[PDB]
Amino acid sequence: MHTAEFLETEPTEISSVLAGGYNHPLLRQWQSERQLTKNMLIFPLFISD
Amino acid sequence: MHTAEFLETEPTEISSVLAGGYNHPLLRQWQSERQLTKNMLIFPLFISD
């Protein structure tokens, strides 16, 4: 039978662990360097004669 | 009479001129590296037993 091989691995290094930062939708917001607000938006208008 | 003395000065250097960046309230918003949104706020609660 081909079976599921699992290698022997060492304890988790703290340096490896990023997951605590984005496990919840509010944190995925928190991770943004800046949020999208209405006053950031500029809308083009084409004026005809 | 003491009168209002005005010194002779040279033409404006472009490097001196910052005013075009914040003459309107929308620009003073634009100048922020990031805007204040509701989801940035964390409120402390003191729970009693």
Residue A30 with chain B: CB contacts under 8 Å: 39
Tokens linked to A21: 């930062």
CA distance B36 to B42: 13
Q: Does A23 touch chain B (CB under 8 A)?
A: no
Longest CA pairwise span in chain A (Å): 78
Tokens linked to A37: 């607000």
Give residue for tokens 């060492």: A10
Resolution of the determined structure in angstroms stands at 1.8
* Number of alpha helices (DSSP H) and beta strands (DSSP E) in chain A: 1, 0
Residue B13: half-sphere exposure toward Cβ, Cα within 13 Å: 3
A28, A20 Cβ separation under 8 angstroms? no
CA distance B35 to B31: 10
Radius of gyration of chain A (CA): 24
Break sites following residues in chain B (C–N > 2.5 A): none
Q: Does A35 touch chain B (CB under 8 A)?
A: yes
CA B33, chain centre distance (Å)? 11
Residue B33 with chain A: CB contacts under 8 Å: 34
Q: Does A25 touch chain B (CB under 8 A)?
A: no
CA distance B22 to B19: 6
